[PDB]
Amino acid sequence: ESTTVKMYEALPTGPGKEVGTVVISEAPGGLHFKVNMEKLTPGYHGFHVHENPSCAPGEKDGKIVPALAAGGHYDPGNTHHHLGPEGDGHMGDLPRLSANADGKVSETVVAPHLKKLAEIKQRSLMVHVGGDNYSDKPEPLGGGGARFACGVIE
């Protein structure tokens, strides 16, 4: 199977402009994520499956957090730590995306630990402002920081 997810900029006011799409498809080496996105800052961006089928903001510690309602990283093993697509932490950890000088992402990444699309239906896809060092050191959650764009996987 396959599905296409529309990605919207995550604002304090919720979903903003459409910034691109992700096609998720099944493949021998693990799920493929074909990403076409624009208006990113050049450089690496963290990319993860989050646990809830919502991209709404929320409040944490009295602060409005764009796309907070997507929850944390998809983590069916309840591992509670971030180890990237080759580690055995959050199963939602995908390979980082690479935006070029024009702010565009156009690539496929592969999650060898995810086999079936059904595993991540009714979840969400998140692209972050920061990158992803596949660790919780020196910063939590790979240093992804704020949520840049989000889409629901139906």
The binding site consists of 48, 50, 73, 82, 90, 93, 128
Instruction: Determine if 48 is a binding residue for Cu ion (CB under 5 A).
Output: yes
> How many residues appear in the chain?
154
Q: Site residues (CB under 5 A) for Zn ion?
A: 73, 82, 90, 93
In degrees and rounded to multiples of 5, residue 65 shows phi and psi of -115, 110
Q: Work out what residue 126 binds among Zn ion, Cu ion, none; the CB cut-off runs from 5 to 8 Å by kind.
A: Cu ion
Q: How far is the CB of 114 from Zn ion (least distance, A)?
A: 13
90 binds, among Cu ion, Zn ion, none (CB under 5 to 8 A by kind): Zn ion
Which residue is closest to Cu ion by CB? 48
- For CA atoms 4, 48, 52, 88, the dihedral sign is positive
Are the C-beta atoms of 93 and 112 separated by less than 8 Å?
Answer: no
126 scored as a contact of Cu ion (CB under 5 A):
yes
> Alpha carbon of 11 to those of 18, 68, 109, 146: distances in Å?
12, 11, 25, 10
Residue 59 CB, nearest approach to Cu ion (Å): 18
The entry of Cu ion, Zn ion, none near residue 93 (CB within 5 to 8 angstroms by kind) is Zn ion
